[PDB]
Amino acid sequence: ESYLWRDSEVSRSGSGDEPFGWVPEAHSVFTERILAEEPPYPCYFGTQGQQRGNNSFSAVDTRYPDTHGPAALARSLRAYRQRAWQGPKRQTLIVFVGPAVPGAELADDHRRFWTLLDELRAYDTEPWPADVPADPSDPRWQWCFDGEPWFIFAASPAYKDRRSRDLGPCLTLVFQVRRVFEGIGGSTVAGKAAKRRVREGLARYDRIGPHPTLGDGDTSTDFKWRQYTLPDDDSVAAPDACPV
Ligand code: HEM
Ligand SMILES: NC(=[NH2+])NCCC[C@H](N)C(=O)O
């Protein structure tokens, strides 16, 4: 019924040539990435959330869009939002989009990601937040669903130098509600300490440095969309080029 899974429920996602028959493998690669010991995954928060049982999963199967597509993901997002606002603050939803496409370029995976986020809006039950501009060209735009803005980023196997955003063979969407950042807002002492620690991790793991669009946390950053789909290099997209 529900396509929202905890780690122990993933194996029932699918088998074989079924819808989601590739999902257990995608899940297994993801957990190996973020639990690796040497070098450790740069985001220790994410590692800790996995070890502690606080990550949830879902998927989109491009071969079954009527049943295992954007409409179903929108249901899973609503169920996740409810779980994310209870119990531990540091929860993440990880969504695999598959099956994997051997040979896909990063730009192909980014286009897929934006099309998904665009499409999901049609299946929201709630009014768009009246304090968040709905127009993606606005500097204060953020992707919103079920009444609130989310934190969201795209992971792909086509990230070569920014290996931290290679989470396995599928386009992967990593969703969180703002609750995750309680106590470690970018302007707090703890929040700065967390940036230093993750950034040291990145230097160890990736071949390219942290991207310029990740700010210092002292103000709300304009054109947050850019952080959703970082390039594999140091280039900065035109602020008006959000594909939604
Ligand atoms: C499975 C879950 C997670 C993954 C895969 C993950 C992944 C990442 C990655 C790849 C970055 C580097 C910046 C970027 O590419 O956008 C990052 C940075 C960060 N993450 Fe995580 N994360 C996870 C969960 C969390 C959670 C649950 C929190 C908070 C509780 C958190 C806090 C942060 C912080 C503070 C940074 C540093 C941002 C900066 O230096 O500006 N992450 N995360
Ligand atoms: N797990 C992550 N990559 N988090 C990115 C945080 C984005 C940032 N706090 C902002 O809204 O400007």
Side-chain angles (χ1 to χ4, degrees), residues 119-174:
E119 281 174 357
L120 279 160
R121 288 183 299 166
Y123 297 99
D124 199 353
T125 55
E126 299 309 308
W128 183 275
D131 61 351
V132 180
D135 186 337
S137 80
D138 188 297
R140 288 154 290 143
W141 188 79
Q142 296 183 76
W143 190 85
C144 300
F145 184 90
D146 208 45
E148 63 196 67
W150 294 58
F151 297 149
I152 167 76
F153 77 87
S156 162
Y159 284 105
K160 290 309 189 264
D161 288 343
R162 203 186 302 292
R163 290 185 43 242
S164 58
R165 283 195 169 198
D166 173 2
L167 292 174
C170 292
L171 172 67
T172 303
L173 275 67
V174 177

Coordinates of all heavy atoms in Angstrom, one line a residue, residues 119-174:
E119 N 6.4 18.3 -11.5 CA 5.3 17.4 -11.6 C 4.6 17.2 -10.3 O 3.4 17.1 -10.2 CB 5.6 16.1 -12.2 CG 5.7 16.1 -13.8 CD 6.1 14.8 -14.5 OE1 6.5 13.8 -13.9 OE2 6.3 14.9 -15.7
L120 N 5.4 17.1 -9.2 CA 5.0 16.8 -7.9 C 4.0 17.9 -7.4 O 3.1 17.6 -6.7 CB 6.0 16.7 -6.8 CG 6.7 15.3 -6.7 CD1 8.0 15.5 -6.0 CD2 5.9 14.2 -6.1
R121 N 4.2 19.1 -7.9 CA 3.3 20.2 -7.4 C 1.9 19.9 -7.7 O 1.0 20.5 -7.1 CB 3.8 21.5 -8.0 CG 5.1 22.0 -7.4 CD 5.5 23.3 -8.1 NE 5.6 23.2 -9.5 CZ 5.7 24.2 -10.4 NH1 5.8 25.4 -10.0 NH2 5.6 23.8 -11.7
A122 N 1.6 19.3 -8.9 CA 0.3 19.1 -9.4 C -0.5 18.1 -8.4 O -1.7 18.1 -8.5 CB 0.3 18.5 -10.8
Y123 N 0.2 17.3 -7.7 CA -0.3 16.3 -6.8 C -0.3 16.7 -5.3 O -0.8 16.0 -4.5 CB 0.3 14.9 -6.9 CG 0.1 14.4 -8.3 CD1 1.1 14.6 -9.3 CD2 -1.1 13.8 -8.7 CE1 0.9 14.2 -10.6 CE2 -1.3 13.4 -10.0 CZ -0.3 13.5 -10.9 OH -0.6 13.1 -12.2
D124 N 0.0 18.0 -5.0 CA -0.1 18.5 -3.7 C -1.6 18.9 -3.4 O -2.3 19.5 -4.2 CB 0.7 19.8 -3.7 CG 1.1 20.4 -2.3 OD1 0.6 19.9 -1.3 OD2 1.9 21.5 -2.3
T125 N -2.0 18.6 -2.1 CA -3.4 18.8 -1.6 C -3.5 20.2 -1.0 O -4.6 20.6 -0.8 CB -3.8 17.8 -0.6 OG1 -2.8 17.8 0.4 CG2 -3.9 16.4 -1.2
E126 N -2.3 20.8 -0.7 CA -2.3 22.0 0.2 C -2.0 23.2 -0.7 O -1.3 23.1 -1.7 CB -1.3 21.9 1.3 CG -1.5 20.8 2.3 CD -3.0 20.8 2.8 OE1 -3.3 21.9 3.2 OE2 -3.7 19.9 2.7
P127 N -2.6 24.4 -0.3 CA -2.1 25.7 -0.9 C -0.6 25.9 -0.8 O 0.0 25.4 0.2 CB -3.0 26.7 -0.2 CG -4.2 25.8 0.3 CD -3.6 24.5 0.7
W128 N 0.0 26.5 -1.8 CA 1.4 26.9 -1.8 C 1.6 27.8 -0.7 O 0.8 28.7 -0.5 CB 1.8 27.5 -3.2 CG 3.2 27.8 -3.3 CD1 3.8 29.0 -2.8 CD2 4.3 27.0 -3.8 NE1 5.2 28.9 -3.1 CE2 5.5 27.7 -3.6 CE3 4.3 25.7 -4.3 CZ2 6.7 27.2 -4.0 CZ3 5.5 25.2 -4.7 CH2 6.7 25.9 -4.6
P129 N 2.6 27.7 0.2 CA 2.8 28.7 1.3 C 2.7 30.1 0.9 O 3.4 30.5 -0.1 CB 4.1 28.3 1.9 CG 4.2 26.8 1.4 CD 3.7 26.8 0.1
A130 N 1.9 31.0 1.5 CA 1.6 32.3 1.1 C 2.8 33.2 1.4 O 2.9 34.3 0.8 CB 0.3 32.8 1.7
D131 N 3.8 32.7 2.1 CA 5.0 33.5 2.4 C 6.2 33.1 1.6 O 7.3 33.6 1.9 CB 5.3 33.6 3.9 CG 5.6 32.3 4.6 OD1 5.4 31.2 4.0 OD2 6.0 32.4 5.8
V132 N 6.0 32.2 0.7 CA 7.1 31.7 -0.1 C 6.7 32.0 -1.6 O 5.6 31.6 -2.0 CB 7.5 30.2 0.0 CG1 8.6 29.9 -0.9 CG2 7.9 29.9 1.4
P133 N 7.4 32.8 -2.3 CA 7.0 33.1 -3.7 C 6.8 31.9 -4.5 O 7.6 31.0 -4.3 CB 8.2 33.9 -4.2 CG 8.8 34.5 -3.0 CD 8.6 33.5 -1.9
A134 N 5.8 31.7 -5.3 CA 5.6 30.5 -6.1 C 6.4 30.6 -7.4 O 6.6 29.5 -8.1 CB 4.1 30.3 -6.4
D135 N 6.9 31.8 -7.8 CA 7.6 31.9 -9.1 C 9.1 31.6 -8.9 O 9.8 32.3 -8.2 CB 7.4 33.4 -9.6 CG 7.9 33.7 -11.0 OD1 8.8 33.0 -11.5 OD2 7.4 34.6 -11.6
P136 N 9.5 30.6 -9.6 CA 10.9 30.1 -9.5 C 12.0 31.1 -9.9 O 13.2 30.9 -9.7 CB 11.1 28.9 -10.4 CG 9.7 28.3 -10.3 CD 8.8 29.6 -10.5
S137 N 11.6 32.2 -10.5 CA 12.5 33.3 -10.9 C 12.8 34.2 -9.7 O 13.7 35.0 -9.7 CB 12.0 34.0 -12.1 OG 11.0 35.0 -11.8
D138 N 12.0 34.1 -8.7 CA 12.1 35.0 -7.5 C 13.3 34.6 -6.7 O 13.5 33.4 -6.4 CB 10.8 35.1 -6.7 CG 10.7 36.1 -5.6 OD1 11.5 36.1 -4.6 OD2 9.9 37.0 -5.8
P139 N 14.0 35.5 -6.2 CA 15.2 35.2 -5.3 C 14.8 34.4 -4.0 O 15.6 33.6 -3.5 CB 15.7 36.5 -4.8 CG 15.0 37.5 -5.6 CD 13.9 36.9 -6.5
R140 N 13.6 34.5 -3.6 CA 13.2 33.8 -2.3 C 12.4 32.5 -2.7 O 11.8 31.9 -1.7 CB 12.3 34.8 -1.5 CG 13.2 35.9 -0.9 CD 12.4 37.2 -0.7 NE 12.0 37.8 -1.9 CZ 10.9 38.4 -2.3 NH1 9.8 38.5 -1.5 NH2 10.8 39.0 -3.5
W141 N 12.3 32.1 -3.9 CA 11.7 30.8 -4.2 C 12.4 29.6 -3.5 O 13.6 29.6 -3.4 CB 11.6 30.5 -5.7 CG 10.8 29.3 -6.1 CD1 9.4 29.2 -6.2 CD2 11.3 28.0 -6.3 NE1 9.1 27.9 -6.6 CE2 10.3 27.2 -6.7 CE3 12.6 27.5 -6.3 CZ2 10.4 25.8 -6.9 CZ3 12.8 26.1 -6.6 CH2 11.7 25.3 -6.8
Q142 N 11.6 28.7 -3.0 CA 12.0 27.4 -2.5 C 11.0 26.4 -2.9 O 9.8 26.8 -3.0 CB 12.1 27.3 -1.0 CG 13.1 28.2 -0.4 CD 13.1 27.9 1.1 OE1 13.6 26.9 1.5 NE2 12.6 28.9 1.9
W143 N 11.4 25.2 -3.2 CA 10.4 24.1 -3.4 C 9.6 23.8 -2.2 O 10.1 23.6 -1.1 CB 11.1 22.9 -4.0 CG 10.1 21.8 -4.5 CD1 9.5 21.8 -5.7 CD2 9.5 20.7 -3.7 NE1 8.7 20.7 -5.8 CE2 8.7 20.0 -4.6 CE3 9.7 20.3 -2.4 CZ2 8.0 18.9 -4.2 CZ3 9.1 19.1 -2.1 CH2 8.3 18.4 -3.0
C144 N 8.2 23.9 -2.3 CA 7.3 23.7 -1.2 C 6.3 22.6 -1.6 O 6.0 22.4 -2.7 CB 6.5 24.9 -0.9 SG 7.5 26.4 -0.4
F145 N 5.9 21.9 -0.6 CA 4.9 20.8 -0.7 C 4.3 20.5 0.7 O 4.9 20.5 1.7 CB 5.7 19.6 -1.3 CG 4.8 18.4 -1.6 CD1 4.1 18.3 -2.8 CD2 4.6 17.5 -0.6 CE1 3.3 17.2 -3.0 CE2 3.7 16.4 -0.8 CZ 3.1 16.2 -2.0
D146 N 2.9 20.3 0.6 CA 2.1 19.9 1.8 C 2.2 21.0 2.9 O 2.3 20.7 4.0 CB 2.5 18.6 2.4 CG 1.4 17.8 3.1 OD1 0.3 17.8 2.6 OD2 1.7 17.2 4.2
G147 N 2.3 22.3 2.4 CA 2.2 23.4 3.3 C 3.5 24.0 3.8 O 3.5 25.0 4.6
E148 N 4.7 23.4 3.4 CA 6.0 24.0 3.9 C 7.1 23.9 2.9 O 7.0 23.0 2.0 CB 6.3 23.3 5.2 CG 6.6 21.9 5.1 CD 6.6 21.2 6.5 OE1 5.5 21.1 7.2 OE2 7.7 20.7 6.9
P149 N 8.1 24.7 2.9 CA 9.3 24.5 2.2 C 10.1 23.3 2.6 O 10.1 22.9 3.8 CB 10.2 25.8 2.3 CG 9.6 26.4 3.6 CD 8.2 25.9 3.8
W150 N 10.8 22.7 1.7 CA 11.7 21.5 2.1 C 13.1 21.8 1.8 O 13.5 22.6 0.8 CB 11.3 20.3 1.3 CG 9.9 19.7 1.6 CD1 8.7 20.4 1.5 CD2 9.6 18.5 2.2 NE1 7.7 19.6 1.9 CE2 8.2 18.4 2.3 CE3 10.4 17.3 2.5 CZ2 7.5 17.3 2.7 CZ3 9.7 16.2 2.9 CH2 8.3 16.1 3.0
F151 N 14.0 21.1 2.4 CA 15.4 21.0 1.9 C 15.5 19.8 1.0 O 14.9 18.7 1.3 CB 16.3 20.7 3.1 CG 16.4 21.8 4.1 CD1 16.7 21.4 5.5 CD2 16.4 23.1 3.8 CE1 16.8 22.4 6.5 CE2 16.5 24.1 4.8 CZ 16.7 23.7 6.1
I152 N 16.1 19.9 -0.1 CA 16.1 18.9 -1.2 C 17.4 19.0 -2.0 O 17.8 20.1 -2.4 CB 14.8 19.0 -2.0 CG1 15.0 18.1 -3.2 CG2 14.4 20.4 -2.5 CD1 14.9 16.6 -2.9
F153 N 18.0 17.9 -2.3 CA 19.1 17.9 -3.3 C 19.1 16.7 -4.1 O 18.5 15.6 -3.7 CB 20.5 18.2 -2.7 CG 21.2 17.1 -2.0 CD1 22.0 16.2 -2.7 CD2 21.0 16.9 -0.6 CE1 22.7 15.2 -2.0 CE2 21.7 15.9 0.0 CZ 22.5 15.0 -0.7
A154 N 19.8 16.8 -5.3 CA 19.9 15.7 -6.3 C 21.3 15.1 -6.1 O 22.3 15.8 -6.2 CB 19.7 16.3 -7.7
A155 N 21.3 13.7 -6.1 CA 22.5 12.9 -6.2 C 22.4 12.0 -7.4 O 21.3 11.7 -7.9 CB 22.5 12.0 -4.9
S156 N 23.6 11.8 -8.0 CA 23.7 11.1 -9.3 C 25.0 10.4 -9.4 O 26.0 10.9 -9.0 CB 23.5 12.1 -10.4 OG 24.0 11.6 -11.7
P157 N 25.1 9.2 -10.1 CA 26.3 8.6 -10.4 C 27.3 9.4 -11.3 O 28.4 9.1 -11.4 CB 26.0 7.3 -11.1 CG 24.6 7.5 -11.6 CD 23.9 8.5 -10.7
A158 N 26.7 10.4 -12.0 CA 27.4 11.2 -12.9 C 28.3 12.3 -12.2 O 29.1 12.9 -12.9 CB 26.5 11.8 -14.0
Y159 N 28.1 12.5 -10.9 CA 29.1 13.3 -10.2 C 30.4 12.6 -10.0 O 30.4 11.7 -9.2 CB 28.6 13.7 -8.8 CG 27.6 14.8 -8.7 CD1 26.3 14.4 -8.4 CD2 27.9 16.1 -8.9 CE1 25.3 15.4 -8.3 CE2 26.9 17.1 -8.7 CZ 25.6 16.7 -8.6 OH 24.6 17.6 -8.4
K160 N 31.4 13.1 -10.7 CA 32.8 12.4 -10.7 C 33.7 13.1 -9.6 O 34.3 12.4 -8.8 CB 33.3 12.6 -12.1 CG 32.6 11.7 -13.0 CD 32.5 10.3 -12.5 CE 32.0 9.3 -13.4 NZ 30.6 9.1 -13.1
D161 N 33.8 14.4 -9.6 CA 34.7 15.1 -8.7 C 33.9 15.4 -7.3 O 34.5 15.3 -6.3 CB 35.2 16.4 -9.3 CG 36.3 16.1 -10.4 OD1 36.8 15.0 -10.4 OD2 36.5 17.0 -11.2
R162 N 32.6 15.7 -7.4 CA 31.8 15.9 -6.1 C 31.2 14.6 -5.7 O 30.0 14.3 -5.9 CB 30.8 17.0 -6.4 CG 30.4 17.7 -5.1 CD 29.3 18.7 -5.3 NE 29.7 19.8 -6.2 CZ 30.7 20.7 -6.0 NH1 31.2 20.9 -4.8 NH2 31.1 21.5 -7.0
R163 N 32.1 13.6 -5.3 CA 31.8 12.2 -5.1 C 30.8 12.0 -3.9 O 30.0 11.1 -3.9 CB 33.1 11.5 -4.8 CG 34.2 11.3 -5.8 CD 35.3 10.4 -5.2 NE 34.9 9.2 -4.4 CZ 35.1 8.8 -3.1 NH1 36.0 9.4 -2.2 NH2 34.4 7.8 -2.6
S164 N 30.8 13.0 -3.0 CA 29.8 13.1 -1.9 C 28.3 13.0 -2.4 O 27.4 12.7 -1.7 CB 30.1 14.3 -1.1 OG 30.1 15.5 -1.9
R165 N 28.1 13.5 -3.7 CA 26.8 13.5 -4.2 C 26.6 12.3 -5.2 O 25.5 12.2 -5.8 CB 26.4 14.8 -5.0 CG 26.1 15.8 -4.0 CD 25.5 17.0 -4.7 NE 24.9 18.0 -3.7 CZ 24.0 18.9 -4.1 NH1 23.3 18.8 -5.2 NH2 23.8 19.9 -3.2
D166 N 27.5 11.4 -5.2 CA 27.3 10.1 -5.9 C 26.9 9.1 -4.8 O 27.7 8.5 -4.1 CB 28.5 9.7 -6.6 CG 28.5 8.2 -7.2 OD1 27.5 7.5 -7.1 OD2 29.5 7.8 -7.8
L167 N 25.5 8.7 -4.8 CA 25.0 7.8 -3.8 C 24.7 6.5 -4.3 O 24.0 5.7 -3.7 CB 23.8 8.5 -3.1 CG 24.1 9.7 -2.3 CD1 22.8 10.3 -1.8 CD2 25.1 9.4 -1.1
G168 N 25.0 6.3 -5.6 CA 24.7 5.0 -6.2 C 24.3 5.2 -7.7 O 24.4 6.3 -8.2
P169 N 23.7 4.1 -8.3 CA 23.5 4.1 -9.7 C 22.3 4.8 -10.2 O 22.2 5.0 -11.4 CB 23.4 2.5 -10.0 CG 22.9 1.9 -8.7 CD 23.4 2.8 -7.6
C170 N 21.4 5.3 -9.3 CA 20.2 6.0 -9.7 C 20.3 7.5 -9.3 O 20.9 7.8 -8.3 CB 19.0 5.4 -8.9 SG 18.6 3.7 -9.3
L171 N 19.7 8.3 -10.1 CA 19.2 9.6 -9.6 C 18.5 9.3 -8.3 O 17.6 8.5 -8.2 CB 18.2 10.2 -10.6 CG 17.5 11.5 -10.1 CD1 18.5 12.6 -9.9 CD2 16.4 12.0 -11.1
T172 N 19.0 10.1 -7.3 CA 18.5 10.0 -5.9 C 18.1 11.4 -5.4 O 19.0 12.3 -5.4 CB 19.6 9.3 -5.1 OG1 19.9 8.0 -5.7 CG2 19.1 9.1 -3.7
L173 N 16.9 11.5 -4.8 CA 16.5 12.8 -4.3 C 16.6 12.6 -2.7 O 16.1 11.7 -2.2 CB 15.1 13.1 -4.7 CG 14.9 13.7 -6.1 CD1 15.3 12.8 -7.2 CD2 13.5 14.2 -6.3
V174 N 17.2 13.6 -2.0 CA 17.3 13.6 -0.6 C 16.5 14.7 0.0 O 16.9 15.9 -0.3 CB 18.8 13.7 -0.2 CG1 19.0 13.7 1.3 CG2 19.7 12.5 -0.8

